[PDB]
Design a protein around this ligand. Structure first.
Ligand SMILES: *C(=O)[C@@H](NC(=O)/C(=N\O)c1nsc(N)n1)[C@@H]1NC(C(=O)O)=C(CC2=CCN([C@@H]3CCNC3)C2=O)CS1
Ligand SMILES: [Cl-]
Ligand SMILES: [Cl-]
Length: 502
């Protein structure tokens, strides 16, 4: 006949911003039209104008209402403007109503879709930060008591039991200016190199903050139809790959920390191959005999780093890689985030000792690799990762000794600046440092560059990953390295970092 009933008051979901307060996810009022079938069933002569106004075929609309003739609630159409959502109301159809609802809009769209993620039709976090921080963002719905007549129509608002509480604002670590730059340059790089996909991560080496995180391909989170699963992947956190030669600076850190190696020491890598039983370690360039430790990194000699690894033992190398976080949980709690795999042994065999040292048979994410380089850049101290703005920086862990870290930094500056080095990674006006990698996938390759700058007082670490570029010959520092140069140049300028190569 008629009942007093309690119902929800929806909460205003919290604003997501970038680190400087630029809006990334905003709850915006949209007009929704709904209907009460029991009321509609008393006004059937109105149905065709209501259908016509909603762009619906008259018969299909009529069937829908007849089938739901004992329900008290259906949506007619959601996400209209006030002008549209009153245009139907002007018809004054019995049992037809408008409400303002909150739904998400993403002002930067595709540029930060992977990091931010999205909400569903019910305004609850479904992907990315929206999911990860849903409790923070959602707030608590209110509650009102309401008298409903025989048909379910609200005739009295009797009393509000609980007020709604809005969600909390969340400021990300991301700097939208760096994010745009990274987004544009990664996109342009895929085109110029004919690549399938890629990732770019920028980190603050002093604070642990992820300043940028972009992938190709990407998607518009405001227009999610025809949406591919591949386009939605935040590849920087949920794809694993073999890091290859980009781990060599960690092998070198172990070497310098052992007491047995200095940069000017020599290793004989002739004839560019080395047999270990059935396996054969093979260098990309095979016209070398004696190389010093910097030369091994410049030439990216797998044989050279393998011989160092035999001398110092795999255990020291594993420990450096473990401590810098390769194949280890980041603690960010991003949905689908992968940990990868740094294999361990009780007793390391010779073949596995070599392959560990040049990053073969290891599995990492782009965020892990960036974090490892941030530790190296931050004079050997690892600051915990953050996807949110860090005002009070947590204590870091000293993972490589400061002197060893500084020596390796110097060697990586030479990798970029010295004769025969990765000259295209050079950043105009600054000294930069880094290491190239090329990884077989099983004809099909990943091109990698990881580095930091300014070399003499590091501020920013960066990883560029380009998945399957279309170059026949040697990548030769011309695929991922120029992307590092362009994005690092822009990032240092936007953060007002003083040039150190005047
Ligand atoms: C480190 O990255 C080294 N690369 C490897 O040995 C890998 N395959 O080549 C590899 N490691 S793990 C894994 N799954 N694969 C050395 N570094 C580089 C470099 O400095 O870029 C290499 C160069 C290189 C190999 C293949 N190259 C072209 C690809 C397209 N056609 C040839 C290329 O430039 C290899 S040794
Ligand atoms: Cl050769
Ligand atoms: Cl390259």
């Amino acid at each position: 006949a008629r009942s007093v009933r309690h119902i929800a008051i929806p909460a205003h979901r919290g604003l997501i911003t970038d680190r400087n307060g630029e809006p990334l996810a905003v709850s915006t009022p949209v007009t929704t039209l709904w209907a009460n079938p029991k009321e509609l069933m008393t006004a059937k002569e109105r149905w065709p104008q209501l259908a016509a106004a909603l762009g619906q075929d008259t018969k299909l609309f009529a069937d829908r209402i007849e089938q739901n003739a004992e329900r008290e609630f259906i949506y007619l159409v959601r996400g209209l403007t006030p002008e549209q959502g009153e245009g139907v109301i002007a018809l004054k159809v019995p049992g037809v109503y408008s409400i303002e609802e909150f739904r998400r809009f993403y002002p930067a769209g595709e540029v930060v879709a992977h990091a931010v993620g999205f909400t569903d039709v019910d305004d609850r976090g479904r992907e990315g930060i929206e999911l990860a921080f849903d409790e923070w963002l959602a707030g608590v719905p209110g509650k009102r008591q309401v008298l409903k007549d025989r048909r379910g129509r609200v005739i009295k608002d009797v009393q509000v039991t609980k007020n709604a509480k809005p969600g909390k604002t969340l400021a990300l670590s991301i700097d939208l200016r760096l994010q745009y730059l990274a987004h544009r340059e990664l996109r342009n790089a895929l085109l110029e190199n004919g690549a399938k996909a890629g990732s770019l991560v920028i980190m603050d080496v002093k604070t642990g903050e992820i300043l940028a995180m972009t992938n190709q391909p990407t998607y518009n989170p405001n227009n999610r139809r025809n949406l591919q699963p591949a386009a939605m992947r935040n590849r920087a956190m949920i794809d694993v790959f073999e890091p290859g030669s980009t781990v060599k600076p960690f092998s070198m850190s172990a070497a310098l920390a052992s007491g047995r190696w200095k940069p000017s020491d020599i290793v004989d890598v002739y004839p560019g191959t080395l047999q270990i039983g059935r396996y054969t370690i093979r260098d990309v360039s095979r016209n070398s005999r004696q190389l010093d430790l910097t030369g091994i990194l410049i030439k990216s000699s797998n044989v050279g780093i393998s011989k160092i690894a035999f001398d110092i033992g795999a255990e020291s190398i594993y420990s450096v890689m473990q401590q810098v976080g390769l194949g280890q949980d980041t603690g960010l709690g991003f949905p689908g985030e992968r940990v990868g795999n740094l294999p361990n042994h009780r007793k390391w065999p010779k073949a596995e000792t070599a392959t560990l040292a040049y990053g073969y048979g290891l599995s990492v994410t782009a965020i892990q690799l960036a974090h490892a380089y941030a530790a190296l850049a931050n004079d050997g101290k690892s600051v915990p990762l953050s996807m949110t703005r860090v005002d009070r920086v947590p204590d870091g862990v000293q993972v490589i000794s400061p002197e060893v870290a500084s020596t390796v930094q110097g060697m990586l500056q030479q990798v970029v600046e010295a004769q025969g080095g990765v000259f295209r990674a050079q950043v105009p006006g600054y000294h930069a440092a880094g290491k190239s990698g090329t990884a077989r996938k099983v004809n099909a390759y990943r091109s990698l560059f990881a580095g930091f700058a300014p070399a003499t007082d590091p501020r920013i670490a960066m990883v560029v990953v380009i998945d399957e570029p279309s170059k026949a010959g040697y990548f030769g520092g011309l695929v991922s390295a120029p992307v590092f140069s362009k994005v690092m140049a822009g990032a240092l300028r936007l953060m007002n970092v003083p040039p150190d190569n005047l």
